[PDB]
Amino acid sequence: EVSQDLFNQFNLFAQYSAAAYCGKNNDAPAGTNITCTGNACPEVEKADATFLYSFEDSGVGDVTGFLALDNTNKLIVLSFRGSRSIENWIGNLNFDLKEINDICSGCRGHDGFTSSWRSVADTLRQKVEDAVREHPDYRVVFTGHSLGGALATVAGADLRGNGYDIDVFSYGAPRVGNRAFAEFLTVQTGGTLYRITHTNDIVPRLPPREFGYSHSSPEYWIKSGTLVPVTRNDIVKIEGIDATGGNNQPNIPDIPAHLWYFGLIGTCL
Amino acid sequence: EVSQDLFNQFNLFAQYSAAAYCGKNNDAPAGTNITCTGNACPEVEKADATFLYSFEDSGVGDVTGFLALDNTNKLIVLSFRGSRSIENWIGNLNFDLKEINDICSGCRGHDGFTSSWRSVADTLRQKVEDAVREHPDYRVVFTGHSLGGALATVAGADLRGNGYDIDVFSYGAPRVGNRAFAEFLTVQTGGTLYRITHTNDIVPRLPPREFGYSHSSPEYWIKSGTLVPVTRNDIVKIEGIDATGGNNQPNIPDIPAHLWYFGLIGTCL
Numbered sequence A, B: 001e002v003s004q005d006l007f008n009q010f011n012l013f014a015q016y017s018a019a020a021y022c023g024k025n026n027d028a029p030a031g032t033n034i035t036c037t038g039n040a041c042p043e044v045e046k047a048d049a050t051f052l053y054s055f056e057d058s059g060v061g062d063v064t065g066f067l068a069l070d071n072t073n074k075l076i077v078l079s080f081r082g083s084r085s086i087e088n089w090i091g092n093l094n095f096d097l098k099e100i101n102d103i104c105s106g107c108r109g110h111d112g113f114t115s116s117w118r119s120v121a122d123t124l125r126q127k128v129e130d131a132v133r134e135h136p137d138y139r140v141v142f143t144g145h146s147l148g149g150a151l152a153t154v155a156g157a158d159l160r161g162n163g164y165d166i167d168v169f170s171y172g173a174p175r176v177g178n179r180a181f182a183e184f185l186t187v188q189t190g191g192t193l194y195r196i197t198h199t200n201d202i203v204p205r206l207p208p209r210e211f212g213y214s215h216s217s218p219e220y221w222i223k224s225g226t227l228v229p230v231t232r233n234d235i236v237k238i239e240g241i242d243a244t245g246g247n248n249q250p251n252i253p254d255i256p257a258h259l260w261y262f263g264l265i266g267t268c269l
Helices: A004-021 A086-091 A111-118 A121-134 A147-159 A179-187 B004-019 B042-046 B086-090 B111-134 B147-159 B179-187
Strands: A049-058 A063-070 A075-080 A097-100 A107-110 A139-145 A166-171 A193-198 A219-222 A235-238 B049-058 B063-070 B075-080 B097-099 B108-110 B139-145 B166-171 B193-198 B219-222 B235-238
Touching: A004 A063, A004 A075, A004 A139, A004 A147, A004 A166, A004 A193, A049 A121, A063 A121, A063 A147, A075 A121, A075 A147, A097 A111, A107 A111, A107 A179, A111 A147, A121 A147, A139 A147, A147 A166, A147 A179, A147 A193, B004 B042, B004 B075, B004 B139, B004 B166, B004 B193, B049 B111, B063 B111, B075 B111, B075 B147, B097 B111, B108 B111, B108 B179, B111 B139, B111 B147, B139 B147, B147 B166, B147 B179, B147 B193
Parallel strands: A075 A139, A139 A166, A166 A193, A193 A219, B075 B139, B139 B166, B166 B193, B193 B219
Antiparallel strands: A049 A063, A063 A075, A097 A107, A219 A235, B049 B063, B063 B075, B097 B108, B219 B235
């Protein structure tokens, strides 16, 4: 259903997100080769990939992650880590929508996450633009898992439209706001956002559509189970805003599913 | 380089060992189907397997585990859980011997795995005698990962001799005694020991061959990496008390390889 080529990119950014959690990237220097504990990012390891700037608890929300240069894949990857302790971070999630208009008219975006990027935007936007300058032939991708995901999406739609495309790969990201917004992220150019989800991952269930939230389109939904290897013949395009048969199926959800996107993610052996 | 039937048994007992850490298994009413959280033990979930005796923290060594009635596989399984933090248990690992002539004359063992077992030995011997009575033709199998492995092994060697074979499958087990214990465990009667190791796993290399400890033979080595699916082709039979060319290689150990035996084990998603 999804192309071998999209499958590799999905896999690779899953590893870049997982690397945000695992091995020597929580804080660190510049130029460092990227490596992960417990085989958590082999495809990144296999690439000529190097740190550009590493961050932590940046601004009001606690923003942690890195900016990488991948000479093999021709990339500049900004990766946002999610929470240190997920189950905590889960129950505490305020269903609250602050209007997004700067980013788009009539739109609505989650106060916690919406407020979280602004906190840091200028100090990193800068650091990206700089890299863009050095390798203007390189594709800018922002990725992230969980809280890291949400950030990426917010950093992305935000910082888009200054001349350089911004792809986003989110793995197990939650809703960031409203049906207008959703429609925005769906047709907004200069970056194709790829919202990846798994089975009944609890994160992209929240917040609910019952609370006026919605998700952008399409959604990429991994139907293979937890700990199960992923093949490109297990990933389905759920095109149509909030179409069902997706992470939005009617049924009951789970956390171990949040930790399995292609490989182990948001935790570290 | 092992048979298929052998592979399935490896895999089922890895799940059975996993379950000892994960699921609603830690204490539940007898007769309830055995289950786990985070896709830990699906082949055990597939079977008609219920708990017989549930325990945890019992013993003078906080010994944790379960006895399990498997109608589908026609087995009686006794499963021992490892430490809750394999690190604070690797770190704190005391290597002092003790006499174990009850098991085998001359043999000396780790005062720790011996004593925690000795304390639960009567009470658990009894409970297996009831299921063996209840099911004379069922296979008694003792299993465990990490510490669990070790205990299981020290149980097997000890309870063999009552008129029923006791097979042992340990996963990433530590070395358990001197050269006398080994040989007893390499050629002893009344049940086969299947000692499974993965790559550069750490615990099977402890305690050192230079604190008076040695390995039972044979060894079934898993060559596939951490977070990599296991095939019959990725297991290799390593022959010989303390042989090398498997796990017992002069290289640098790895905690995460210990946490992957056919699937996730030693931790829960």
